[PDB]
Design a protein around this ligand. Sequence first.
Ligand SMILES: [Mn+2]
Ligand SMILES: [Mn+2]
Ligand SMILES: [Mn+2]
Length: 245
Amino acid sequence: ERPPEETLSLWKGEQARLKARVVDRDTEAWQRDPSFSGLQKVGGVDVSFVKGDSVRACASLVVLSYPELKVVYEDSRMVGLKAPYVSGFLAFREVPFLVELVQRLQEKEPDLMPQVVLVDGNGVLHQRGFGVACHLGVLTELPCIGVAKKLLQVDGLENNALHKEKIVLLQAGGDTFPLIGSSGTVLGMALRSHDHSTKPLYVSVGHRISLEVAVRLTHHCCRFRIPEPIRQADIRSREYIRRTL
Ligand SMILES: [Mn+2]
Ligand SMILES: [Mn+2]
Ligand SMILES: [Mn+2]
């Protein structure tokens, strides 16, 4: 079910301590290049589940070439998922297994280590400004982008009529609008990822990248609505579950 409040408080404390290590600017040379020259390997991570289970999950790490977006590395494996899902605490469920996959990549094919990881879930667009993409980035020290498929309603952000009016105004792939918190902060961007998709992605900084670069790279990874590194990790982990079950 739901962890007790004292557990959630401990987790909140750890998130606030680790947030001090988030770097929300560009630290990689390819990031400031108008065409991302020098970017060669983009990672994606996801965890799929089997219905009725809650103990078993499949965690996948893929690495794709850039800009061709072909899969050059895949590790999909079964894991014994502990913690339940609680909004705002996604990392405490998934991130320790994702870190293990990165370490296995380091040990098995270190030349294919990704230069940036696209994470299925938010970064600083988060209840305490420290989502799963930040958490992964800080623990692995890799640049990370948070990509969410629906709006986390925090800091006054709401999926109301005005928000949906703004989504209608997004007309083609690459079009965006900023997610401005009540605090005066830009927490992320709504991105229309494709010409033939109207439901936006919600993109935010995970670690070691600026928001404007994160959005533009995310856009360049979209053959479909979901950025191809996450899409392949999503597709491959679900297939793995089905193949062994
Ligand atoms: Mn996911
Ligand atoms: Mn799903
Ligand atoms: Mn998924």
